Design a protein around this ligand. Structure first.
Ligand SMILES: [Zn+2]
Ligand SMILES: [Zn+2]
Ligand SMILES: [Zn+2]
Lengths: 171, 56, 86, 49, 167, 56, 144, 111, 98
């Protein structure tokens, strides 16, 4: 799911950037340290909105580091997965332990036990694929997956999905 | 270049990554090339401020 | 921000304290040692502490001192506006 | 050499807060631990790799 | 702020619309003003993201079928974003290949369409992201819709959502 | 208080009474190895952008 | 049959394996002898008690005795309770045998090495099916 | 060398909240249940699992890792085990405090 | 294993420096080894070749001089033990008390 979130970050500036154009460096650091990053609390931080109007507060010199610590408030578009949510994606990898679906910046892992019984793994075909009477699931195929679990770490999110329920699977 | 056995000299070189180089056992590859932001742990020289104390 | 006293009613001394000068010189000296842009002209000087002293004398240290009060409130004083008389 | 309590008192009387910290931290045992925001205990298992 | 120790927290679950602690319905922005949780469907998210990229490109410089749009987004992405953008490239590529509403007019119609139901922001965003043909499909793909909207309204809403589908 | 005398008795009473220590004294900061709010620590040093832009 | 949990010190830069490693104990450093890179710092060099894990194995025990202030009642009962432990009973037999071996070896004016070997011989040869119908005196005399 | 980089934010201790451990907390915090009064197994080559020096509580040797965090001696803070006592026992440092509470409340209804 | 960084060049086959030899800091004056138990690897560096570990006695770090006397005898228990004496001359300097 895509949300527009109000986020805060603590950025550190090396003393080498204590010049008349330090605010630009803070903006560059924000786009280089936040955009594309993953946080278990807010999901994948994708894009920073209103790049011209970030609120840069007064910086605090750290006692022994000598660097300035800036609190930065910004508005960003973040993708956060939730268990029980249904998403669409493209299969990127297939193996004996199931296939992986790519949904935006996230990869959902579908285990065999979360697949319908008829589906079976066929390593003989190149590329390997899951074959059943009605459909074939392979790399680049489009699958509707229901996220069954999400484990969020401070800098990583991994989810497991299922295609057993009705109206799921190959699109 | 002087090394750790001649005052004024130096004992360690610390790179920006946090790696510390003992100047003993380091001359095998020759003198190290210094870079900005590095640290040279060198002998305390003249006019260095130091705290001088007598107990009690 | 109720703990930031507006500049028009600051009741603290307009003079830099000895501890404020010591930390400002040490703070700016450390920054100079880390290749910070020097805003004062150097007529020949390599010690970061001496460069900081030159900056303080010419009022070119871009720092402010957040003086804290025993109730949690604070006052912001620029190094340029603080009198260095001690 | 021992930087004892009396020495600490003298440095407090000098107002050298940063020097007092460096003596007690970087000239002696300095250790980094991970604490939990819910419980203030040092019971966080950190797989830093 | 008083003491805090382990309290039993409602496990996150989309089916129950229990989105957690930071994704509550009522949010507080940087100005302290109360706001509703902004949930975006795939088409809305695609427009919002690429609307900021063009503005970002404008900032630096001053101081359509699927394939061509995909390439245009790709070239714009590399120009207007910094390093370690491996996630944003996949996101923009994923949004172009899974969006149902192309232009702003189409998206604007959807927003003015689904806001009459009074559903949760998560539910409306889901109804604009997944193509459902029957009310039963939306009732099982979005378990939260159960006992919130009658099949009579859902059937017509899905029909109108499928109506404004380009290509 | 535990730094002076009766260290363990004071700490047990702190536990039973669930005392909150706000770490505003020198001893608490010495124990935690952080800059005490004394002398050079009685204030914070911030960076001034308004002056940075005009110093060039 | 268990987790590895082994740390091997090698120079990331030199990459030569096995590496030349020098332990600068005075400096508290472990340094690569070829490049000088330091691999581990802050190496370490009554609060405990010693025991010999060759005659006693793994058995940590503590005595109960009087202090600067003590009532004989508590000491007598605590010793009474401590004696009635079922697990420590097994090893006390070996310790009692050690005590008598020490007494015999001391009344014989024998060196400490002799009694240490005698006690070790007893422990190794004890608790076996062959020596179960023989008197303890024969066991002790043979061990000595 | 120094300690390895961490992704957690670096903060300064602002408050210390003293208190008492609950039995539930001691069990939850514990990484292992200590049930053997030994330190090494019968071979005296490795530490006994479930004993005092369980490899799960940390390591104090420069050559071994912690089985819990997989970090060396200079990074592992140590991990707590727990022993479930057969019967409740007093805390020697609170007996006087415990006595005073007993004289304050009824010893049959706790009021 | 665990041999000290000093020099063993002055020891003889019996692990003792002959009297009359000059010694300095970190020099080993009594060489001794003890056997080790297998299945214990430290910092790697422990191969099948290694079967002994160093238990030597080095000269005091700050002291130097010439070995004056070495006597080898047996204790009350019959174990071999040795005494090594080292000579040095102290000449008055700017820190000596009189
Ligand atoms: Zn916790
Ligand atoms: Zn090397
Ligand atoms: Zn550990």
């Amino acid at each position: 799911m895509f949300f527009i979130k109000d986020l805060s970050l603590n950025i550190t500036l090396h003393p080498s950037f204590f010049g008349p154009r330090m605010k630009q460096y803070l903006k560059t650091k924000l786009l280089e340290e936040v955009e594309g990053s993953c946080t278990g609390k807010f999901g994948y931080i994708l894009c920073v909105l209103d790049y011209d109007n970030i609120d840069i507060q007064r910086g605090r010199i750290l006692p022994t580091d000598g660097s300035a610590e800036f609190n930065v408030k910004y508005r960003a578009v973040v993708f956060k997965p939730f268990k029980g949510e249904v998403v669409d994606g493209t299969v990127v990898s297939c193996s004996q332990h199931g296939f992986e679906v790519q949904v935006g910046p996230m990869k959902v892992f579908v285990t065999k036990h979360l697949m319908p019984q008829d589906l079976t793994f066929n390593a003989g075909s190149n590329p390997p694929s899951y074959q059943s009477s009605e459909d074939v699931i392979t790399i680049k195929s489009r699958i509707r997956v229901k996220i069954e679990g999400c484990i969020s770490q401070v800098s990583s999110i991994h989810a497991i999905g299922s295609i057993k329920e009705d109206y799921l699977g190959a699109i | 270049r002087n090394g750790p056995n001649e005052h004024p000299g130096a004992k360690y070189v610390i790179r920006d990554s946090g790696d510390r180089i003992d100047l003993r056992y380091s001359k095998r590859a020759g003198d190290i090339q210094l870079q900005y932001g590095w640290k040279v742990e060198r002998h305390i020289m003249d006019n260095d401020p130091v705290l001088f104390n007598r107990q009690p | 921000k109720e703990k930031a006293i507006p500049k028009d009613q600051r009741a603290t001394t307009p003079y830099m304290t000895k501890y404020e000068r010591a930390r400002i010189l040490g703070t700016r000296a450390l920054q100079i040692s880390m290749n910070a842009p020097v805003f004062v002209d150097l007529e020949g000087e390599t010690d970061p502490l001496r460069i900081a002293m030159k900056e303080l004398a010419e009022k070119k240290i871009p720092l402010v001192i957040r003086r804290y009060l025993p109730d949690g409130s604070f006052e912001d004083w620029s190094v340029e506006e603080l009198i260095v008389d001690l | 050499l021992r930087f004892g309590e009396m020495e600490r008192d003298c440095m407090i009387a000098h107002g050298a807060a940063s020097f007092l910290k460096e003596r007690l931290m970087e000239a002696s045992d300095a250790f980094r631990v991970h604490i939990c925001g819910i419980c203030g205990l040092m019971t966080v298992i950190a797989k830093l790799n | 702020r008083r003491r805090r120790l382990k309290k039993v927290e409602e496990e996150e679950n989309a089916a129950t619309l229990q989105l957690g602690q930071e994704f509550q319905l009522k949010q507080i922005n940087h100005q302290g003003e109360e706001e509703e949780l902004i949930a975006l469907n795939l088409s809305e998210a695609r427009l919002v993201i690429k609307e900021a990229l063009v503005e970002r490109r404008r900032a630096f410089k001053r101081s359509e079928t699927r394939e061509k749009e995909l390439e245009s987004i790709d070239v714009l992405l590399e120009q207007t974003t910094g390093g370690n953008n491996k996630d944003l490239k996949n996101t923009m590529q994923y949004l172009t290949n899974f969006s149902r509403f192309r232009d702003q007019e189409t998206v604007g119609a959807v927003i003015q369409l689904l806001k009459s139901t009074g559903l949760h922001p998560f539910e409306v965003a889901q109804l604009g992201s997944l193509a459902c043909d029957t009310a039963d499909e939306a009732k099982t793909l979005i378990p939260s819709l159960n006992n919130k909207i009658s099949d009579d309204e859902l059937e017509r809403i899905l029909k109108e959502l499928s109506n404004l589908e380009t290509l | 208080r535990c730094s002076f005398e009766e260290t363990v008795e004071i700490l047990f009473e702190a536990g039973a009474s669930a005392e909150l220590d706000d770490c505003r004294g020198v001893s608490e900061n010495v124990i935690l190895g952080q800059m005490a709010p004394i002398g050079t620590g009685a204030f914070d040093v911030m960076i001034d952008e308004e002056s940075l832009v005009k110093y060039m | 049959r268990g987790p590895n949990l082994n740390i091997v010190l090698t120079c990331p830069e030199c990459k030569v394996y096995p590496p030349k490693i020098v332990e600068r104990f005075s400096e508290g450093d472990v340094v690569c002898a070829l490049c000088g890179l330091v691999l581990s710092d802050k190496l370490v060099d009554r609060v405990g008690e010693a025991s010999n894990p060759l005659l006693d194995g793994n058995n940590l025990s503590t005595r109960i005795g009087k202090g600067e202030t003590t009532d004989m009642r508590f000491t007598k009962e605590l010793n009474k309770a401590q004696g009635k432990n079922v697990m420590d009973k097994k090893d006390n037999e070996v310790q009692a045998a050690f005590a008598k071996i020490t007494m015999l070896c001391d009344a014989a004016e024998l060196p400490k090495i002799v009694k240490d070997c005698a006690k070790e011989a007893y422990k190794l040869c004890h608790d076996e099916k062959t020596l179960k119908g023989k008197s303890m005196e024969s066991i002790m005399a043979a061990s000595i | 060398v120094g300690q390895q980089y961490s992704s957690a934010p670096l903060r300064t201790v602002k408050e210390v909240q003293f208190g008492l451990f609950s039995p539930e907390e001691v069990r939850a915090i514990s990484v292992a249940k200590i049930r053997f009064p030994e330190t090494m197994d019968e071979t005296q080559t490795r530490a006994k699992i479930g004993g005092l020096n369980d490899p799960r509580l940390g390591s104090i040797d420069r050559n071994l890792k912690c089985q819990t965090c997989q970090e060396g001696m200079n990074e592992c803070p140590g991990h707590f085990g727990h022993i479930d006592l057969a019967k409740p026992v007093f805390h020697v440092g609170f007996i006087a405090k415990i006595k005073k509470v007993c004289e304050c409340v009824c010893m049959h209804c706790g009021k | 294993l665990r041999m000290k960084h000093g020099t063993y060049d002055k020891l003889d086959d019996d692990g003792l420096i002959a009297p009359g030899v000059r010694v300095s800091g970190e020099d080993v004056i009594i060489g001794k080894t003890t056997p080790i138990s297998p299945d214990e690897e430290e910092l790697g560096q422990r191969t099948a070749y290694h079967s002994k570990r160093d238990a030597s006695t080095p000269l005091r770090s700050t002291e130097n001089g010439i070995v004056d006397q070495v006597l080898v005898t047996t204790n009350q228990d019959g174990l071999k033990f040795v005494k090594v004496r080292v000579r040095t001359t102290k000449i008055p300097q700017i820190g000596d008390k009189f």
